[PDB]
């Protein structure tokens, strides 16, 4: 939602709403899942290791 204070920990995975119309768990239009990830295959450069 916004910026967090120094030395803080947050674990909330609630759906994030930007363009109104909350999805309420649908994770579809006008809503994005807060949590993301990426692969860790060894064939990556120094910019992704």
């Amino acid at each position: 939602k916004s910026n967090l204070k120094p030395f803080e920990r947050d674990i909330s995975t609630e759906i994030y709403q930007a363009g109104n119309k909350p999805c309420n768990g649908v994770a579809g239009f006008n809503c994005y899942f807060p949590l993301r990830s990426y692969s860790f295959r060894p064939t990556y450069g120094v910019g992704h290791q």
């Binding site: 930007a18 363009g19 994005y32």
Partner: protein
């Protein structure tokens, strides 16, 4: 030499596949970047990924 107000450009899309990299999808209005290019075509459904 104009403003691209994407607030209506993403529109009432039934499904907008706005998988974007290098910037958060909402923080482009405040950006004042350089020229943009437009081009489009049509692809069979399966291999959109």
């Amino acid at each position: 030499n104009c403003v691209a107000d994407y607030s209506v450009l993403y529109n009432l899309a039934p499904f907008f596949t706005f998988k974007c990299y290098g910037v958060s999808p909402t923080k482009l209005n405040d950006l004042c970047f350089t020229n943009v290019y437009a081009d489009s075509f049509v692809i069979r459904g399966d291999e959109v990924r």
